[PDB]
Design a protein around this ligand. Structure first.
Ligand SMILES: [K+]
Ligand SMILES: [K+]
Ligand SMILES: [K+]
Ligand SMILES: [K+]
Ligand SMILES: [K+]
Ligand SMILES: [K+]
Ligand SMILES: [K+]
Ligand SMILES: [K+]
Ligand SMILES: [K+]
Ligand SMILES: [Mg+2]
Ligand SMILES: [Mg+2]
Ligand SMILES: [Mg+2]
Ligand SMILES: [Mg+2]
Ligand SMILES: [Mg+2]
Ligand SMILES: [Mg+2]
Ligand SMILES: [Mg+2]
Ligand SMILES: [Mg+2]
Ligand SMILES: [Mg+2]
Ligand SMILES: [Mg+2]
Ligand SMILES: [Mg+2]
Ligand SMILES: [Mg+2]
Ligand SMILES: [Mg+2]
Ligand SMILES: [Mg+2]
Ligand SMILES: [Mg+2]
Ligand SMILES: [Mg+2]
Ligand SMILES: [Mg+2]
Ligand SMILES: [Mg+2]
Ligand SMILES: [Mg+2]
Ligand SMILES: [Mg+2]
Ligand SMILES: [Mg+2]
Ligand SMILES: [Mg+2]
Ligand SMILES: [Mg+2]
Ligand SMILES: [Mg+2]
Ligand SMILES: [Mg+2]
Ligand SMILES: [Mg+2]
Ligand SMILES: [Mg+2]
Ligand SMILES: [Mg+2]
Ligand SMILES: [Mg+2]
Ligand SMILES: [Mg+2]
Ligand SMILES: [Mg+2]
Ligand SMILES: [Mg+2]
Ligand SMILES: [Mg+2]
Ligand SMILES: [Mg+2]
Ligand SMILES: [Mg+2]
Ligand SMILES: [Mg+2]
Ligand SMILES: [Mg+2]
Ligand SMILES: [Mg+2]
Ligand SMILES: [Mg+2]
Ligand SMILES: [Mg+2]
Ligand SMILES: [Mg+2]
Ligand SMILES: [Mg+2]
Ligand SMILES: [Mg+2]
Ligand SMILES: [Mg+2]
Ligand SMILES: [Mg+2]
Ligand SMILES: [Mg+2]
Ligand SMILES: [Mg+2]
Ligand SMILES: [Mg+2]
Ligand SMILES: [Mg+2]
Ligand SMILES: [Mg+2]
Ligand SMILES: [Mg+2]
Ligand SMILES: [Mg+2]
Ligand SMILES: [Mg+2]
Ligand SMILES: [Mg+2]
Ligand SMILES: [Mg+2]
Ligand SMILES: [Mg+2]
Ligand SMILES: [Mg+2]
Ligand SMILES: [Mg+2]
Ligand SMILES: [Mg+2]
Ligand SMILES: [Mg+2]
Ligand SMILES: [Mg+2]
Ligand SMILES: [Mg+2]
Ligand SMILES: [Mg+2]
Ligand SMILES: [Mg+2]
Ligand SMILES: [Mg+2]
Lengths: 393, 46, 240, 122
RNA sequence: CUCGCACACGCUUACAUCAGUAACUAAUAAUAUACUGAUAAUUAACAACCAAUAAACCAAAACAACACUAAAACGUUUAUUAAUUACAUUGUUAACCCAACACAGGAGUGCACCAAGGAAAGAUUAAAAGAAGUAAAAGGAACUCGGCAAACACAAACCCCGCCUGUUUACCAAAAACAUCACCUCUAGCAUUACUAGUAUUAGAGGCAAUGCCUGCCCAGUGACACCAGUUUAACGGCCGCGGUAUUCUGACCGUGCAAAGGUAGCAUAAUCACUUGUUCUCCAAAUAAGGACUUGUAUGAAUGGCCACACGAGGGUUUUACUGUCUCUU
RNA sequence: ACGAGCUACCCAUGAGCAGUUUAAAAGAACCAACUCAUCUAUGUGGCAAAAUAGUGAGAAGACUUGUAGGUAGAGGUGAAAA
RNA sequence: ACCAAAGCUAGCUCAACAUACUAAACAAAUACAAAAAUACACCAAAAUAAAAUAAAACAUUCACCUAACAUUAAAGUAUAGGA
């Protein structure tokens, strides 16, 4: 084969030993006595350096297998920055779900009612977009890492103002950079969702089930799509050190034990840095399942069985101009077999909130054709955004 | 087109080309130091 | 002063790697090849020449992979295609009509009768039909593809005698090689690279070629249309 | 050109060149780049109590001088260790093997303030 | 009247307060940012110094929605480690640097063109000559190598050589020279520092210059290859005499000789030895100029390229129109 | 032996090109900053051991430019001007 | 009458003798860009000296020219040289 090393770039091998060391029963004469190099004297051979007392920073890195949690079985870990090729298909396969196009009827009918709209919904959102992209920064062209979290937080505040009309939104609170872990066995291979999230919303009361029993039974006969050349593991991180313990972000007795909404933000200036929309939807599927799986085992036990009371977790992905919406319901814990009841997940793909924005007025032939402000606006994207936020109430 | 200002000062370049460290890295450079020490120079190198 | 070559990466990775131009200067620092330098900055893609390479040694059997996308590689004159299978991805040279969402079979089992020649499959020269167009020729078993990789270049198998295959290189020179070497069926992509026309002197500078020297050299005896018989067949088979 | 016969200090070079003027380091760089100053490396000045101490920086002019006799390693031994050794040998208790009771120390690394390595600054 | 504030690079107290200048420094005097003596000063938040390994990740910056070819600087997260302990060290002035000078020169970035920064005349007289600027009667290139310079002009056309943008003799030549897209010849079957992390649609050693129509004949010599016969000129190079012949002129033709073949197509008094101011026509009142033809150029000529054309030119030559102190002729 | 802090070329790492005309960021066009130096006049121990004034060519590219590194005299480098 | 003129020390040269030959100063900092207390290394090397000149040119040759252990003689002798 063609090994990728280069002789010049690789570290040189040690120089050949002097001929004196090859003579049996002959003590070589070295310059180690004078502790400096001298021509004509043999080069000493020293034993490996052994510091009597260990020092934290300057010691060599311990081997991986020295860690107490090291295990022979290879566990696959999915953190935030893992990319899946067949994002919708791999996430569906690893989670044993059935993709249903369109938001659930409870969510969609919760936004079409005019009695659930903020005052000046059209105007305020238009101000929110302008504030996010042009007004919030002193610079003329704000970068994406600045206006990606601003636009999401601004829209959260708009739907937060509905607490006066619905005095039950006070049961929610946000959490930041929590540590989440959920390990499950899936067809003779071990998977684990480990890492953090952008923004998390938790509520005191659990979210009611959203799928009718007719759809759950229809899920039994659904067969998961398969792809032969690509293994389902591809895209994950193979870790030999791990702990088999489903650890959520909070300790026992937390007054907000039921997660409600996950906010994933792809904020990065460069195009290759950000997730593709297909891969971004995969990121939401697994993390929404990991939070759902943690509740399903904390509230019921480590035993794997079908859940009589489903757990519902929502998640919203944002690019700064394009949105992704996901509502996931968890029904099955025994994921080893593929013949039982599958889970459900409603996904709306590529909800375009606005087409384009012009920070500066474009001038063609000394006249203004398109003034400053967003071009094209779809209020339904925010209307669906408002629907998910008010789902609990 | 108007010569005479060929010397553009720079401390990074001056200490890298005529520095004391460079003079002691080449066998010919060390002989330069030896000649200036023998002659009695006040400054062996930059 | 001795310089350091940029080819220091040890582990294969599909993502583009940083690249430093040379300009014809050797490690010493003197010009050795003229007319090179001042090109557009480029990134290098790690190309996997060895078509047959199992993920693990537990299962040495033939495996089948899937093509994801076909991209443009600034370094070589051909087009490379991303290929994924199992738990790894590879950049391999795409043939004439390789597209996205396609399946490519890699195998080494030398069968007696034959194997149907597809446009992307890689099979040993012992199982291919006599009249097959091939590229990425492996000179020795396990050495890797070295020959026939330029754009639009395809070699044709001639005959298989006493367990040894003879192929025709694009230079119309016959080459003898053991039949167990892996080769790819088809013609290399970007067929009309030869018909590309450079519109101005600047486009040469963008590619990275400096203009020739202005010294006027009188032609010697080397010039003139030379008619020479074809050199004999080059054989890499070691006869015991 | 430039002056090659002057002192090369931190003020002459660019912003990259920052050479200390001779101070002793008191720490290192931490994780975030904030300078972590080690408490031990700071020289803790030790001072006595001069309130109940009667002595002045000047001596009276009428006070006589003395014959300048520099202290000798031989004179110190005859003053401190000789009386102890002499009495023990006359009583028959002298032990040539062990001399630790007379103030001799075989290895310096045991004690806090070595002598040949010169552990203490002053 | 307008190159102003600040940082980087550089210089190194030349900066500040007070006092002195008979003399030293300023190309003079007053005088003191520039000469002498004493004293004093730049305080970190800004800037320098400011972790390692393993793993996941094919998807450009141009308001970036999405695309082009020349394929593009710009990283996050998970895992294993990382002395944990107020106050560390260092750069903070300036009218400044490189050019022998307190030099009309050279000098990167940000923001302004000012709210900031500065003084063309030491005092007179108002000669010639010289430099720079404005105006002019009638004429408008009659000046002169040339319309150089100047102008209330700021247009039109022909030709020669190069196709074009570009490049070169820093400090007498910026061109018709070199490069260049195109075409063609030649040498190479391939691995860890160039060529190349490439593999004959590739890469080097060269010639000639886009395009269009073409690139004729010649391996005798030399060179190269074959390394033998031999093969090669888009390899170096070459590509003919004498005599007679249709009334006269011309010479289709014929005799004879030598060669490896005897200059083919084209163009042409040309940037092409001399003859030469060839001859003729057009342009002008007048033409050694310019364009168009005639043409043995016995020394034009076909990739050491011939020929034709669009576009282009601070190249070279000519004509018309408009302007003007170039000039009649200076004030 | 010492020299690539000027210059020829290259490898790194950075930074500039406003307005105007066009489906054009097209080695297109008008014109600044910026970079070269065509023609003439002053200057000729000069302000200057190659400059000043007027006028000019390019000005989204084979373009200018800062920092730093590489090639050294039987050589380096060269869009050949010895 | 100005500008000027005069002085005799500083030290040096060549030997001899001679110990036997990198002085004086080294508290701290000195081969990071020397004079900057403090971190996992790489370290190092040799290949005949050539020519200016003489032979009235210049190609074989051209004393001394790095390494001889001296002096009185043998002797500018034997020999080696485009002899
Ligand atoms: K290519
Ligand atoms: K200074
Ligand atoms: K004339
Ligand atoms: K020019
Ligand atoms: K021949
Ligand atoms: K003519
Ligand atoms: K020109
Ligand atoms: K250098
Ligand atoms: K000047
Ligand atoms: Mg000089
Ligand atoms: Mg410079
Ligand atoms: Mg290349
Ligand atoms: Mg060429
Ligand atoms: Mg040429
Ligand atoms: Mg000097
Ligand atoms: Mg400095
Ligand atoms: Mg500075
Ligand atoms: Mg601190
Ligand atoms: Mg100075
Ligand atoms: Mg003055
Ligand atoms: Mg004063
Ligand atoms: Mg002063
Ligand atoms: Mg002067
Ligand atoms: Mg004045
Ligand atoms: Mg005057
Ligand atoms: Mg006058
Ligand atoms: Mg006038
Ligand atoms: Mg008049
Ligand atoms: Mg006339
Ligand atoms: Mg006349
Ligand atoms: Mg002339
Ligand atoms: Mg003129
Ligand atoms: Mg002519
Ligand atoms: Mg030209
Ligand atoms: Mg022409
Ligand atoms: Mg030009
Ligand atoms: Mg010149
Ligand atoms: Mg120039
Ligand atoms: Mg000139
Ligand atoms: Mg042709
Ligand atoms: Mg041509
Ligand atoms: Mg040419
Ligand atoms: Mg020509
Ligand atoms: Mg020919
Ligand atoms: Mg022959
Ligand atoms: Mg003609
Ligand atoms: Mg002609
Ligand atoms: Mg003539
Ligand atoms: Mg003429
Ligand atoms: Mg005339
Ligand atoms: Mg003519
Ligand atoms: Mg001729
Ligand atoms: Mg020829
Ligand atoms: Mg000719
Ligand atoms: Mg053209
Ligand atoms: Mg012209
Ligand atoms: Mg006229
Ligand atoms: Mg340089
Ligand atoms: Mg512009
Ligand atoms: Mg242009
Ligand atoms: Mg000028
Ligand atoms: Mg001028
Ligand atoms: Mg004028
Ligand atoms: Mg112009
Ligand atoms: Mg132009
Ligand atoms: Mg050197
Ligand atoms: Mg040379
Ligand atoms: Mg050049
Ligand atoms: Mg020439
Ligand atoms: Mg010449
Ligand atoms: Mg001689
Ligand atoms: Mg003589
Ligand atoms: Mg000699
Ligand atoms: Mg003889």
């Amino acid at each position: 084969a063609y090994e990728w090393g280069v002789r010049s770039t690789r570290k040189p091998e040690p120089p050949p030993l002097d001929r004196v060391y090859e003579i049996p029963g002959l003590e070589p004469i070295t310059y180690a006595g004078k502790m400096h190099f001298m021509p004509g004297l043999a080069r000493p051979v020293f034993p490996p350096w052994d510091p009597g007392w260990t020092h934290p920073k300057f010691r060599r890195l311990p081997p991986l297998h020295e860690h107490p949690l090291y295990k022979d079985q290879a566990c696959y870990v999915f953190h935030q920055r893992c990319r899946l090729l067949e994002g919708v298909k791999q996430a569906l396969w690893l989670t044993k779900t059935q993709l249903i196009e369109g938001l659930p009827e409870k969510v969609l009918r919760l936004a079409d009612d005019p009695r659930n709209h903020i005052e000046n919904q059209d105007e305020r959102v238009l101000n929110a977009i302008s504030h996010a992209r042009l007004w919030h920064s002193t610079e003329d062209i704000p970068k994406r890492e600045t206006y990606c979290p601003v636009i999401v937080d601004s829209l959260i505040q708009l739907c937060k103002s509905q607490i006066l009309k619905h005095p039950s939104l006070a049961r929610r609170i946000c959490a930041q950079n929590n540590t989440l872990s959920a390990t499950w066995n899936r067809e003779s291979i071990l998977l684990q969702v480990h890492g953090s999230s952008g923004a998390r919303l938790n509520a005191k009361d659990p979210l009611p089930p959203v799928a009718s029993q007719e759809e759950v039974e229809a899920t039994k006969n659904h067969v998961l799509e398969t792809f032969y050349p690509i293994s389902p593991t591809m895209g994950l991180q193979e870790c030999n050190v791990y702990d088999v313990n489903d650890d959520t972000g909070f300790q026992e007795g937390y007054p907000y034990p039921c997660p409600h909404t996950l906010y994933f933000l792809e904020s990065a200036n460069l195009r290759p840095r950000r997730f593709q929309p297909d891969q971004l939807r995969a990121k939401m599927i697994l993390f929404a399942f990991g939070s759902a799986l943690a509740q399903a085992r904390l509230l019921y036990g480590n035993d794997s069985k079908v859940l009589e009371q489903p757990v519902v977790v929502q998640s919203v992905g944002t690019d700064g101009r394009l949105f992704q919406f996901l509502v996931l319901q968890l029904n099955t814990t025994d994921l080893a077999s593929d013949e039982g009841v599958k889970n459900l997940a409603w996904v709306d793909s590529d909800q375009l909130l606005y087409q384009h924005f012009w920070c500066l007025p474009v001038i063609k032939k000394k006249v203004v054709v398109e003034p400053v402000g967003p071009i094209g606006f779809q209020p339904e994207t925010f209307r669906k955004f408002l629907a998910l936020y008010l789902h609990g109430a | 087109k108007a010569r005479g200002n060929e010397y553009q000062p720079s401390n990074i370049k001056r200490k890298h080309k005529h520095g004391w460290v460079r003079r002691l890295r080449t066998p010919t450079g060390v002989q330069v130091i030896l000649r200036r020490m023998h002659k009695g120079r006040k400054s062996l190198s930059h | 002063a001795t310089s350091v070559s940029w080819k220091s990466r040890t582990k294969y990775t599909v993502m583009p790697v940083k690249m430093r131009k040379s300009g014809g200067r050797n490690h010493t620092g003197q010009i050795q090849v003229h007319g090179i330098g001042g090109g557009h900055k480029q990134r290098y893609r790690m190309i996997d020449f060895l078509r047959f390479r199992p993920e693990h040694e537990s299962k040495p059997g033939p495996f089948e992979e899937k093509v994801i996308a076909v991209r443009y590689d600034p370094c070589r004159s051909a087009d490379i295609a991303l290929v994924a299978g199992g738990n790894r991805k590879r950049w391999i040279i795409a043939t004439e009509n390789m597209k996205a969402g396609d399946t490519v079979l890699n195998s080494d089992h030398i069968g007696r009768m034959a194997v149907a020649a597809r446009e992307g499959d890689a099979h040993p020269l012992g199982a291919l039909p006599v009249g097959t167009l091939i590229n990425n020729v492996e000179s020795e078993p396990g050495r890797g593809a070295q020959y026939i990789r330029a754009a639009g270049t395809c070699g044709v198998l001639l005959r298989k005698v006493n367990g040894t295959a003879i192929i025709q290189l694009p230079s119309k020179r016959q080459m003898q090689v053991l039949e167990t070497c892996i080769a790819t069926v088809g013609r290399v992509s970007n067929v009309d690279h030869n018909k590309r026309v450079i519109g101005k002197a600047g486009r040469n500078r963008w590619l990275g070629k400096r203009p020739n020297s202005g010294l006027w050299q009188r032609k010697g005896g080397w010039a003139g249309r030379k008619i020479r018989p074809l050199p004999p067949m080059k054989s890499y088979v070691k006869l015991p | 050109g430039a002056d090659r016969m002057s002192k090369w200090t931190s003020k002459r070079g660019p912003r990259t060149f920052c050479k200390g003027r001779g101070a002793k380091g008191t720490g290192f760089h931490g994780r975030d780049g904030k300078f972590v100053q080690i408490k031990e490396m700071i020289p803790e000045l030790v001072v006595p109590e001069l309130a109940g101490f009667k002595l002045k920086p000047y001596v009276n002019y009428r006070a006589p001088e003395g014959t300048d006799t520099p202290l000798t390693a031989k004179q110190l031994f005859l003053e401190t260790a000789a009386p102890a050794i002499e009495k023990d040998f006359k009583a028959g208790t002298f032990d040539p093997e062990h001399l630790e009771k007379y103030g001799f120390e075989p290895t310096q690394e045991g004690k806090l303030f070595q002598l040949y390595p010169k552990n203490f600054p002053r």
